[PDB]
RNA sequence: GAGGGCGCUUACCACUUUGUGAUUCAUGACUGGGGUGAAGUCGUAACAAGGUAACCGUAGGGGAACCUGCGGUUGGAUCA
């Protein structure tokens, strides 16, 4: 029942969280503004730095990338 | 002796070889389009007079649907 056997490289490194619109077009680019709101609020629960480097917005709102 | 056989020889002829051409299948850097997409970008050309009535031939032009010229057609509308 011992829990920490293996090692893990890359495991503490910072991420590049990319979110892209799938099927739906203007609405798949409108749920993508709610996955970014899912993880950017999760990264503030445990004190991380979101850094919006590139973002192209949808027509009716959200993010297409 | 006549005649036959063997040999030789010539004629026809299969193998095989050379030249060139047709044709069909495979393939080829690349390129012209075509078809299918439960989402993208740029427009809105068509269907209502679709907001420039559409369309046919042809010609020229333009990212693209197209647009314009000349002729034609009604498979156009409104005529108070
Ligand atoms: Mg139109
Ligand atoms: Mg117009
Ligand atoms: Mg018109
Ligand atoms: Mg027109
Ligand atoms: Mg018409
Ligand atoms: Mg012109």
Burial class (CB in 10 A: 0-12, 13-18, 19+), A62: buried
CA of A59 to the centre of ligand 3 (A): 29
Of A21, A33, A24, nearest to A61 (Cα)? A33
Nucleotide nearest to A28 (CA to C1'): B39
CA dist., res. A52 & res. A39, Å (int): 12
For chain A, breaks with the C atom over 2.5 A from the next N come after: none
Give A10's DSSP letter: T
Asked whether A35 and A43 are in contact (CB, 8 A), the reply is no
Name, in order, each residue with C-beta under 8 angstroms of A62's C-beta and a sequence gap of 6 or more: A21, A29, A30, A31, A32, A33, A34
CA of A7 to the centre of ligand 6 (A): 71
Residue A59 Cβ < 7 Å to strand B: yes
Of A53, A24, A23, nearest to A36 (Cα)? A53
Method used to determine the 3D structure:
cryo-EM
Resolution of the solved structure (Å): 3.5
Residue A44 Cβ < 7 Å to strand B: no
């Amino acid at each position: 029942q011992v829990l920490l056997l293996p090692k893990d490289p890359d495991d503490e490194r910072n991420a590049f969280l990319e979110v892209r619109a799938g099927t739906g077009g203007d609405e798949a680019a409108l749920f993508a503004g709610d996955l970014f709101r899912m993880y950017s609020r999760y990264a503030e629960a445990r004190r991380w730095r979101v850094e919006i480097m590139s973002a192209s917005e949808g027509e009716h709102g959200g993010y297409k990338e």
